[PDB]
């Protein structure tokens, strides 16, 4: 049997077998219990709706993302995510396949152990391994050097890798993008009188965060032309018939990635965390970290990136240095195409942690 | 025992010879006898003990030392190359179709040879069942029934004709009723027989051809009764299946002076035919006779369906020849085509949503000329039929019309087609029974023929009612077997003994119990304001969370069943094993909605042939109850009569002579309920041998003095000498009865030390002289007491 790559998204959990095209299942991670009393008599209602069904049944449930700030809320809901994914999307039994699971870089111990341990006893997989989402994006882009960005709602990361070794002393985790950008967009859309305070309605905010937002070339000059009469406004239509016109806030929300002072948080922008991680690496290596700046994750899919990022880095970086920023299409599925390449390779079959070895070793094998 | 041969699971032959050379807790390391070095693994429940002499066959299977399904499979493998197609298992006849006519077996001299002869003393044949059923009618003072199962091509048609031949030859003096069923067989090959995934010609109804006998023991008449029909198949079919055969034979065989009167067109047009397979069965010669306008795109692409007997163009001719012979004129034959063509033009009527005016549904504009060409076939008005297919007529006592929803009108339009064709098949059977009216009624010997346990890779609602019908017939099958064995032990003087019975009532309660059963939840889901199939599947494991007869699809070992999601199907264990069913379209196929506004319109037709077909509360009626109610009218009739179970075996997939497939025969032994009955008989005494059988087997091992004795005293002396345990071995009246594996234990005592056996015969020599004295003394006193009876009786004359 065929191995299964299942990505523990922050979004947007992604699932598909090993090779060779695209993921089979992608869905918004949400679990939602019903906040109102039923009067139908069937009864016909589920105890907890997962996505996609919880995104079709908005407004009668209370949506709860099971992974928040890069860590799982409880494994009771997480197990339901897994069960739903394997059985009613992929249509496969875990006993049939070796699996490949993903994690986030700088995640607290003992949450990789507890995960691995529960998943082996609950789903009875014959072998498993847990890879960080950032490392996998190297394979997806066909690179062997560069700084890797796993940016999902709501934890971004900046990991530098050099042919083909990782540098522990320069790894940066920012809790900045993207769920706090969702919350910030909701705070500056209230300023235009649209009240979307409720949990369900927050998903609609997320959808306009995808579609209508853009990044400026320079903030001050976009603000200048905003003061002018020329329309930057785009009109969105809402499920109850309402028409929302956003303009100024449209470029304000993504610009936060370069200026976190908009949220009021002390942390520095992607601009400077890129530079400061490069300048924590040895002198000879710095040469090839420039021009292997590879963006990844769905929250980097705004149009004005990477050429904003490019212009800003080129201004702070040493003169006459070659800087190219690598941003392909499909960054949301980058991780999955990474994992797919990995699990197909020899000899990594023998790098998987198998059940008998796990049973003897216990949680200490993980690291 | 060690060193002794066992049967081994071989995929191509079912079971082969083999030995055990290593063993573990759950597995046996099996080395084959003929293929040494192949050494495979097999489980504890997959191996069976084999007999020492495997080159011999037995007419009666209770004469085996090891009675199991592997020694039954080898008994019908040896008998197949000796051309012995009939095999006696107690009250069960196993008949294997050879696909060739065997000499002298159907002879009238053979028929009068069997007549009145005792049972078991004559070779197994189908005439030995029919002669027994006449004698266990008149003596018993009760009516009889011959039960014929099996899949298509297993000889169930041919075995039925030999039963009706024996009753109008051996006991019936005249009455030519036997071939009136045979002559109007193509009518039931069109109306009742359809096409399923594993069978090209399958009967989909409970055929109960009964033969009336009077008190003077003469054939006074016959009657044909029909039970069950696949209501769903009429309007919607599965993948690669067909509807009934009259909806293809009328399309294929119709002329152009008939097509102008019925307005027939190619099957692609019609919604009740384009869902499944539109192809006709034909041969090269008849493929040239099918007209261009009768061909569908699927027919152009893939051509005619291949079968050695079915011809949809040519059997329409032999159908209309049989309607001339039975009793139908050409005007009445045309009225049996106007009803069929009216069903075809009903299924294309669609229903959109009304424009907010009073709620409900309206017909589509593309369905307007399609209604005009349908209402003159039904004898009704097009403006009154449009109201009746969209409204719920009731009274407030004025009479109001309250419109229906779109989904309820699609179900009501197909409910009219599942009512008109249902009463049309009941009119064909009643018309045939009026072509041979019975003189009187009293006792009866009938033949029940129906399809066996039939199942496919993905099972439908049509196969759910077949396997539910075979489970209820499996209950009555084991109930009659236990009663025969309890009156065998009494007849041989062994008296009553304890035997364990296997129940299947928990599987019946699972499917049909009130409020909690699967059919009861299904009929309740129709009453809901929004029916669902995901709510139906979850409700089954809501009310039945425990039980062993029901599991989730993912618990199955089969990969195909593991791809089914929890809310898309379920697995129900039956006598023939674990059968999965999908739940998509299950409620839709059950839902029927024939209501007042439409039931009291087709009865009111301006046509006279239509009113003859149909001879507040309840609205939607109870659809899942009609399948239980009609079956109970046959099960209590089978309990009121005697029974003669004839199981029919198909030996190969091609249906060609002299070919044995033991990977297809063994699957029919486990799908006939035969293996289940052999499990029942292990509780009793499954091995029994007559005194003359034990004399022919064991006389060579005995001393010459003991050998001189008659078979009963030979066996009585041998039982007394050895000192055999009374609960394991039992001395009957004509047979010695044995517990499991003790006829085999007996055979090893005779093959053991000749000097030890000779010394035990010396020790019983006084008793044997005393027994041989009392045998001739009480036999001479028997002749004197029958001399004293002749005088005592003639003293009162």
UniProtKB/Swiss-Prot annotation, chain A:
Where N6-methyllysine occurs, the residues are: 80
Q: Which reaction does it catalyse?
A: ATP + H2O = ADP + phosphate + H(+)
GO molecular function, a single term: calcium ion binding
GO-annotated biological processes: actin filament bundle assembly; actin filament polymerization; mesenchyme migration; positive regulation of gene expression; skeletal muscle fiber development; skeletal muscle thin filament assembly
**UniProt keyword terms in alphabetical order:** Acetylation, ADP-ribosylation, ATP-binding, Cytoplasm, Cytoskeleton, Hydrolase, Methylation, Muscle protein, Nucleotide-binding, Oxidation
Q: Which of the seven top EC classes does this enzyme belong to?
A: hydrolase
What does UniProt say on post-translational modification here?
Oxidation of Met-40 and Met-43 by MICALs (MICAL1, MICAL2 or MICAL3) to form methionine sulfoxide promotes actin filament depolymerization. MICAL1 and MICAL2 produce the (R)-S-oxide form. The (R)-S-oxide form is reverted by MSRB1 and MSRB2, which promotes actin repolymerization.
Q: Where in the cell is it found?
A: Cytoplasm, Cytoskeleton
Tele-methylhistidine: residues carrying this PTM = 69
Where Methionine (R)-sulfoxide occurs, the residues are 40, 43
Q: Which residues carry this modification: ADP-ribosylarginine?
A: 173
User: Might you give the EC number(s) for this enzyme?
Assistant: 3.6.4.-
Q: Where is this region: Interaction with alpha-actinin?
A: 106-119, 354-366
Q: Which InterPro entries match?
A: Actin, Actin/actin-like_CS, Actin_CS, ATPase_NBD
Q: Is Cytoplasm there in the keyword field?
A: yes
Recorded GO CC terms: actin filament; actin filament bundle; cell body; cytoplasm; filamentous actin; filopodium; lamellipodium; skeletal muscle myofibril
User: SUPFAM superfamilies recorded for this chain?
Assistant: Actin-like ATPase domain
Q: Does the keyword Nucleotide-binding apply?
A: yes
Q: Which domain of life is it from?
A: Eukaryota
N6-malonyllysine-modified residues are where? Answer: 57
Query: What's the stated role of this polypeptide?
Result: Actins are highly conserved proteins that are involved in various types of cell motility and are ubiquitously expressed in all eukaryotic cells.
Report further notes: In vertebrates 3 main groups of actin isoforms, alpha, beta and gamma have been identified. The alpha actins are found in muscle tissues and are a major constituent of the contractile apparatus. The beta and gamma actins coexist in most cell types as components of the cytoskeleton and as mediators of internal cell motility.
The family annotation for this protein states: Belongs to the actin family.
Q: How the protein assembles, per its UniProt entry? A: Polymerization of globular actin (G-actin) leads to a structural filament (F-actin) in the form of a two-stranded helix. Each actin can bind to 4 others. Interacts with alpha-actinin. Identified in a complex composed of ACTA1, COBL, GSN and TMSB4X. Interacts with TTID. Interacts (via its C-terminus) with USP25.
Record protein name field: Actin, alpha skeletal muscle
């Amino acid at each position: 049997t065929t191995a299964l790559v299942c990505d523990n998204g922050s979004g947007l959990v992604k699932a598909g077998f090993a090779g060779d095209d695209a993921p089979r299942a992608v869905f918004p991670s949400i679990v939602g219990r019903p906040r109102h009393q039923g009067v139908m008599v069937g009864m016909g209602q589920k105890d907890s709706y997962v996505g996609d069904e919880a995104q079709s049944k908005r407004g009668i449930l209370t949506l709860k993302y099971p992974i928040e700030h890069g860590i799982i809320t409880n494994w009771d809901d997480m197990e339901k995510i897994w069960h739903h994914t394997f059985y009613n999307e992929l249509r496969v039994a875990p006993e049939e396949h070796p699996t490949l699971l993903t994690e986030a870089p700088l995640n607290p111990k003992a949450n990789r152990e507890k995960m691995t341990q529960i998943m082996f006893e609950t789903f009875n997989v014959p072998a498993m391994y847990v890879a960080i989402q950032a490392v996998l994006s190297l394979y997806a882009s066909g690179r062997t050097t560069g700084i890797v960005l796993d940016s999902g709602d709501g934890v971004t990361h900046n990991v530098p890798i050099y042919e083909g070794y990782a540098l522990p002393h320069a790894i940066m985790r920012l809790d900045l993008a993207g769920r706090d950008l969702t919350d910030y967009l909701m705070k500056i859309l209230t300023e235009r009188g649209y009240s979307f305070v409720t949990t369900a309605e927050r998903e609609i905010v997320r959808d306009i965060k995808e579609k209508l937002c853009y990044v400026a070339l320079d903030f001050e000059n976009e603000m200048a032309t905003a003061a002018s009469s020329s329309s930057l406004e785009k009109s969105y239509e809402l499920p109850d018939g309402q028409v929302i016109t956003i303009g100024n806030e449209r470029f304000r929300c993504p610009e936060t990635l370069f200026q976190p002072s908009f949220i009021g948080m002390e942390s520095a922008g992607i601009h400077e965390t890129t530079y400061n991680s490069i300048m924590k690496c040895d002198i000879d290596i710095r040469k090839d970290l420039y021009a292997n700046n590879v963006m990844s994750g769905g929250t980097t899919m705004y149009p004005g990136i990477a050429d904003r990022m490019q212009k800003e880095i080129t201004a702070l970086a040493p003169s006459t240095m070659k800087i190219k920023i690598i941003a392909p299409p499909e960054r949301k599925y980058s991780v999955w195409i990474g994992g797919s390449i990995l699990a197909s390779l020899s000899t990594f079959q023998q790098m998987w942690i198998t059940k008998q070895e796990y049973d003897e070793a216990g949680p200490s094998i993980v690291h | 025992e060690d060193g002794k041969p066992v049967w081994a699971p071989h995929p191509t032959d079912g079971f082969q010879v083999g030995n055990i050379v290593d063993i573990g807790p759950d597995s046996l390391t099996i080395e084959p006898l003929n293929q040494k070095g192949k050494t495979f693994l097999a489980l504890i429940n997959q191996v069976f003990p084999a007999e020492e002499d495997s080159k011999k066959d037995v007419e009666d299977n209770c004469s085996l030392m090891y009675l199991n399904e592997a020694t039954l499979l080898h008994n019908i493998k040896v008998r197949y190359s000796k051309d012995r197609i009939y095999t006696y298992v107690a009250n069960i006849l196993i008949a294997v179709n050879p696909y060739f006519d065997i000499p002298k077996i159907y002879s009238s001299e053979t028929i009068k040879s069997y007549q009145g002869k005792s049972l078991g003393t004559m070779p197994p044949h189908v005439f030995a069942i029919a002669d027994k059923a006449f004698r266990d009618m008149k003596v018993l003072k009760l009516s009889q029934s011959i039960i014929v199962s099996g899949e298509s091509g297993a000889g169930k048609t041919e075995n039925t004709k030999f039963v009706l031949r024996y009753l109008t030859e051996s006991y019936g003096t005249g009455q030519d009723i036997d071939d009136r069923i045979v002559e109007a067989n193509p009518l039931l090959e069109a109306f009742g027989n359809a096409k399923t995934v594993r069978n090209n010609n399958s009967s989909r109804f409970g055929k109960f051809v009964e033969i009336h006998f009077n008190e003077k023991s003469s054939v006074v008449g016959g009657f044909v009764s029909h039970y069950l029909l696949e209501k769903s198949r009429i309007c919607v079919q599965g993948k690669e299946e067909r509807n009934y055969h009259i909806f293809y034979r009328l399309c294929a065989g119709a002329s152009e002076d008939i097509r102008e009167r019925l307005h027939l067109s190619s099957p692609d047009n019609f919604r009740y035919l384009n869902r499944g397979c539109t192809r006709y069965f034909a041969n090269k010669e008849t493929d040239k006779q099918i007209l261009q306008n009768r061909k569908s795109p699927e027919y152009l692409k893939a051509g005619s369906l291949k079968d050695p007997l079915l011809d949809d163009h040519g059997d329409f001719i032999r159908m209309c020849t049989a309607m001339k012979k039975i009793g139908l004129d050409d005007e009445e034959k045309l009225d049996l085509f106007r009803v069929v063509a009216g069903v075809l033009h009903l299924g294309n009527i669609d229903f959109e949503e009304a424009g907010s005016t009073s709620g409900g549904c309206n017909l589509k504009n593309k369905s307007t000329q399609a209604l005009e060409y349908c209402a003159e076939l039904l004898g009704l008005d097009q403006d009154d039929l449009r109201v009746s297919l969209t409204t719920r007529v009731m009274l407030t006592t004025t009479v109001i019309k309250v419109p229906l929803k779109v989904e309820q009108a699609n179900n009501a339009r197909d409910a009219l087609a599942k009512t008109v064709y249902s009463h049309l098949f009941d009119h064909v059977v009643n018309r045939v029974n009026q072509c041979f009216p019975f003189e009187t009624s009293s006792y009866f010997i009938g033949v029940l023929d129906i399809a066996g346990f039939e199942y496919f890779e993905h099972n439908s609602f049509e196969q759910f009612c077949i396997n539910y019908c075979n489970e209820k017939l499996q209950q009555f099958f084991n109930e009659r077997i236990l009663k025969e064995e309890q009156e065998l032990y009494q007849k041989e003087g062994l008296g009553v003994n304890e035997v364990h019975y296997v129940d299947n009532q928990d599987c019946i309660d699972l499917i049909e119990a009130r409020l909690v059963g699967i059919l009861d939840i299904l009929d309740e889901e129709n009453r809901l304001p929004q029916p669902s199939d995901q709510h139906f599947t979850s409700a089954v494991h809501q009310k039945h969370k425990d039980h062993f007869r029901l599991s989730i699809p993912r618990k199955s070992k089969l990969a195909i069943h593991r791809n089914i999601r929890d809310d898309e199907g379920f697995i129900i264990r039956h006598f023939a094993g674990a059968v999965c069913y999908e739940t998509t379209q299950f409620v839709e196929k059950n839902n029927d909605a024939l209501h007042m506004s439409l039931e009291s319109l087709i009865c009111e037709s301006r046509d006279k042939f239509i009113r003859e077909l149909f001879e507040g509360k309840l609205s939607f009626i109870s659809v899942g109850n009609k399948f239980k109610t009609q079956l109970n009218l046959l099960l209590d009739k089978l309990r009121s009569t005697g029974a003669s179970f004839i199981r029919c075996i198909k030996p190969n997939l091609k249906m060609t002579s002299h070919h044995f497939e033991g990977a297809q025969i063994l699957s029919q032994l486990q799908c006939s309920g035969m293996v289940s009955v052999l499990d029942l008989m292990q509780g009793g005494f499954p091995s029994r041998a007559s005194f003359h059988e034990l004399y022919n087997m064991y006389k060579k091992y005995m001393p010459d003095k003991l050998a001189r004795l008659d078979p009963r005293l030979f066996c009585k002396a041998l039982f007394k000498a050895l000192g055999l345990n009374e609960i394991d071995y039992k001395f009957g009246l004509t047979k010695v009865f044995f517990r499991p594996g003790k006829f085999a234990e007996f055979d090893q005592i005779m093959k053991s030390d000749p000097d030890h056996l000779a010394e035990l015969v010396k020790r019983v020599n006084h008793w044997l002289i005393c027994s041989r004295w009392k045998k001739v003394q009480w036999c001479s006193l028997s002749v004197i007491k029958l001399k004293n009876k002749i005088k005592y009786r003639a003293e009162a004359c």
